[PDB]
Design a protein around this ligand. Structure first.
Ligand SMILES: CC(=O)N[C@H]1[C@H]([C@H](O)[C@H](O)CO)O[C@@](OC[C@H]2O[C@@H](O[C@H]3[C@H](O)[C@@H](O)[C@H](O)O[C@@H]3CO)[C@H](O)[C@@H](O)[C@H]2O)(C(=O)O)C[C@@H]1O
Length: 811
């Protein structure tokens, strides 16, 4: 219509635009309308129906604190003292703002909702069963992955082999003769890696420790890992001297600088939503991990009939999400370590949980604080998005790597100073079909994969798995957690989390093969063998009752219900590796390849070709003709590294669209690799996602300005000016297209294309989809803001309309 207005953001302002391409007023400054502090930033907003507008705001002054040596007191709190200290040179919590429509365009503020810290029960032998508190006390979170992190930066030294673990050094000879009784019966991999060393490399910090701005170029050579003591005492200076910020003897405004040991990524971190004091627009250390965790956690929202869901960023792992009511004043976050998801099958759930840490009935140690031991599920996610459709919430995220680590004081120990993680790729001998493949026992309870020299060829997966061991081939192929039998009651395994969807950073081929999807069986109609811990995509459909249950849980003050979990049944997991061709080694349009030797040819806005990232989840109802009295079809689409994924749902059941067949690949998931041109689009710069109800199309708008100011080698970023638009469109046979279209053999897919709306010249304001044929690109750069350029769609391909753009341009 003409009456319809398109809203567009610019920092904290939301300006209404008409189809004449002109704005109705100077917009709504969400912060100043809410009577909020000037250090506030608007992070997400949604125009609920015709008269409501919900928004999300956060502050870089927020300061969080965790206590580790009274009654119903929470161990997690806001530190208003530090929040005040930052101001020079209340709690500044995040808020959900509700607005009501008024005369002309304009909005009127209606209320504010505080997103309070999640609850955790504090213990004290000087004041007054699974403990999330113990976990947190020894929880080591990785320093965030930047777009400037090279492949060798991820490359951590491999851990010890499992034959050394169970037999000791010098007694490995007796593997085959004693595997049967040591719980490794028919296990063919004695040389299987237990994990990776935490002695050096990229930073791993405790909940009250801080991540540094500097990062290793190669974690086999430099970095200090979890060793905060050594960094602070000697390596801090080395790092500072190697990678100082722009202005060496000229920073004061409030063997010298080689960049061969570290990369200074202060600029990249800032944009990721990480608080970097000094780089504030609205040397000194960064705020503690728990603070950045709260700040980066309040990034995305949705609205479902008086209920606001708030999830975290797609760039930093999130441990908690809010389910606040429109009526409430505040509201605590719900722990992900307490939100149990259906991973498709019990075995798929097991794979993940089993790697969370060490649990045995002989062990009752407090120092053994890992999530598995505290009976807690998967803690962290890299949330791609959430969207509301047909009175249901849909979401997608990449499961972040959450492993166990050895806390032992004993420096002569096998698993001393290392993280415990192993490959979970299905055996070469796996039975055929999807169900058969995901439920394969290879690496379920412990390591099994490594280099196997099958004839005149190599294989990084086990050639014997499941119920195929022994001479007769009917025996069990066994697997066990890397902790020696006699060392079980004494074991001190804490919990560790990576800022990526991988479990092991072990500098080997097996990891590279798991992350790139290169493990395949030797069948005629060759099937790819999947991982059940590395590069996993979690997605699903939740209802109001599941969300209420997630809210009630968060408001609980631990008590007797302290070990009660949230069960989201209509979710699923899917192995989503990065394209192998993104690396220069294996493009398909020496002594083996390890993480550190893996050269990248990725153009998608990352210095690596090892880690997967997911962004812009958007639902959308198919405008196609409806079947014989059936509900209209709807799907969700998202952009991952290398292609578009489409999540399909049964409208009738309001559940994930299933086929009732175990062998066939799931019809609720589809992945289509996109072309060379769309692989050239920087995915970290996604400004907006938009679905056109009438054309059944998704429009992903990317803005170059969202790129950092300087790279790791402290040089100004190129192509900062410009924008690019991608169109996603439905493809294939649709659920109930005709009468006999009962159950579909294939899954309905999507197609990502750079439709032609692109520039590398001006600063984008936004794109107003005028009609199915014409769209205007509104650009600033010039004095006043508003250049306007009309683009016409020709068979799905945009071309600038010289005539029309020249027309609208005269004031
Ligand atoms: C993950 C893993 O452990 N992979 C190893 C692999 C497998 O153990 C088997 O293929 C299946 O069980 O074997 C690899 O090497 C095969 C050769 O092993 C040689 O034995 C060595 C070896 O170091 C030890 O097994 C032994 O204690 O000492 C021997 C040297 O003195 C054999 O002599 C040879 O015939 C092969 O069988 C493989 O790459 O396939 C090694 C993997 O680490």
């Amino acid at each position: 219509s003409l009456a319809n207005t398109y809203l567009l953001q610019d920092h904290n302002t939301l300006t209404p635009y008409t189809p004449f391409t002109t704005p109705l007023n100077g917009g709504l400054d969400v912060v100043r309308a809410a009577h909020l502090h000037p250090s506030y930033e608007l992070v997400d907003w949604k125009r609920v129906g015709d008269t409501k507008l919900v928004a999300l705001v956060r502050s870089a002054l927020v300061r969080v604190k965790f206590q580790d040596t009274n009654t119903n007191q929470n161990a997690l709190s806001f530190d208003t003292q530090e929040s005040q200290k930052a101001l020079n040179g209340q709690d500044f919590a995040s808020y959900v703002l509700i607005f009501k429509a008024a005369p002309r365009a304009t909005w009127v503020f209606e209320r504010k909702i505080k997103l309070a810290l999640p609850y955790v029960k504090q213990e004290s032998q000087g004041s007054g069963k699974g403990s999330l508190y113990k976990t947190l006390q020894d929880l080591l979170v990785e320093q965030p992955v930047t777009p400037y992190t090279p492949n060798a930066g991820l490359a951590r030294v491999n851990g010890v082999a499992q034959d050394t673990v169970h037999f000791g050094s010098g007694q490995e000879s007796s593997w085959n003769s004693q595997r049967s009784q040591k719980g490794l019966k028919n296990n063919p991999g004695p040389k299987a890696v237990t994990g990776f060393k935490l002695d050096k490399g990229r930073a791993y910090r405790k909940l009250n420790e801080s991540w540094p701005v500097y990062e290793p170029l190669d974690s086999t050579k430099e970095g200090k890992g979890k060793d905060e003591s050594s960094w602070k005492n000697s390596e801090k200076t080395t790092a500072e001297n190697d990678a100082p910020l722009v202005g060496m003897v000229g920073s004061g405004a409030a063997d010298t600088a080689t960049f061969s040991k570290y990369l200074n990524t202060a600029q990249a971190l800032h944009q990721m939503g990480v608080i970097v004091p000094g780089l504030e627009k609205w040397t000194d250390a960064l705020p503690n991990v728990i603070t950045q965790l709260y700040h980066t956690s309040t990034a995305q929202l949705a609205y479902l009939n008086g209920q606001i869901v708030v999830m975290g960023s797609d760039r930093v792992p999130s441990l908690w999400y809010w389910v606040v009511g429109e009526d409430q004043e505040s509201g605590k976050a719900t722990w992900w370590a307490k939100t149990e998801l259906n991973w498709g099958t019990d075995k798929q759930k097991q794979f993940v949980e089993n790697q969370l840490g060490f649990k045995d009935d002989s062990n009752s140690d407090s120092k053994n604080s890992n999530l598995k031991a505290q009976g807690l599920t998967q803690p962290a996610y890299l949330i791609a998005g959430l969207d509301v459709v047909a009175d249901h919430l849909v979401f997608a995220a990449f499961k972040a790597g959450a492993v166990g680590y050895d806390m032992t004081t004993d420096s002569s120990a096998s698993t001393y100073n290392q993280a415990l993680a192993w490959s979970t790729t299905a055996g070469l001998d796996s039975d055929g079909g999807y169900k058969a493949l995901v439920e394969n026992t290879a690496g379920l309870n412990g390591p099994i994969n490594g280099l196997f020299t099958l004839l005149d060829t190599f294989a990084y997966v086990t050639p014997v798995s499941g119920m195929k061991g022994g001479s007769q081939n009917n025996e069990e192929v066994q697997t066990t957690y890397p902790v020696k039998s006699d060392q079980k009651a004494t074991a001190k395994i804490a919990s560790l989390i990576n800022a990526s969807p991988l479990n092991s950073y072990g500098d080997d081929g097996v990891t590279v093969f798991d992350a790139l999807g290169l493990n395949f069986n030797f069948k005629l109609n060759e099937e790819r063998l999947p991982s059940r811990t590395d590069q996993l995509l979690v997605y699903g459909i939740v209802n109001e009752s599941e969300l209420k249950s997630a809210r009630e849980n968060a408001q609980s003050t631990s008590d007797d219900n302290s070990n009660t979990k949230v069960k989201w049944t209509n979710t699923a997991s899917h192995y989503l590796p990065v394209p192998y061709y993104y690396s220069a080694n294996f493009p398909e349009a020496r002594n083996g390849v390890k993480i550190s030797t893996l050269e990248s040819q990725a153009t998608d806005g990352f210095a690596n070709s090892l880690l997967n990232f997911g962004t812009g989840l958007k639902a959308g109802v198919d405008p196609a003709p409806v079947a014989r009295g059936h509900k209209p079809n709807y799907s969700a689409v998202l952009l991952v590294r290398g292609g578009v994924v489409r999540l399909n749902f049964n409208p009738d059941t309001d559940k994930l669209l299933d086929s009732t067949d175990k062998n066939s690949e799931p019809i609720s998931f589809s992945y289509t690799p996109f072309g060379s041109a769309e692989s050239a689009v920087d995915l970290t710069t996604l400004k907006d996602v938009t679905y056109i109800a009438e054309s059944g199309l998704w429009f992903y708008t990317f803005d170059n300005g969202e790129k950092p100011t300087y790279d790791g080698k402290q040089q100004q970023v190129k192509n900062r000016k410009g924008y690019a638009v991608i169109t996603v469109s439905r493809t294939g046979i649709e659920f109930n297209e005709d009468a006999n279209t009962t159950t579909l053999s294939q899954a309905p897919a999507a197609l990502a294309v750079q439709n032609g709306i692109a520039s590398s010249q001006d600063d984008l304001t936004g794109i107003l989809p005028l009609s199915d044929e014409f769209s205007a690109v509104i650009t600033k750069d010039q004095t006043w803001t508003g250049k306007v350029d009309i683009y016409k769609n020709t068979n799905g391909l945009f071309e600038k309309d010289d005539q029309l753009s020249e027309n609208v341009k005269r004031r």
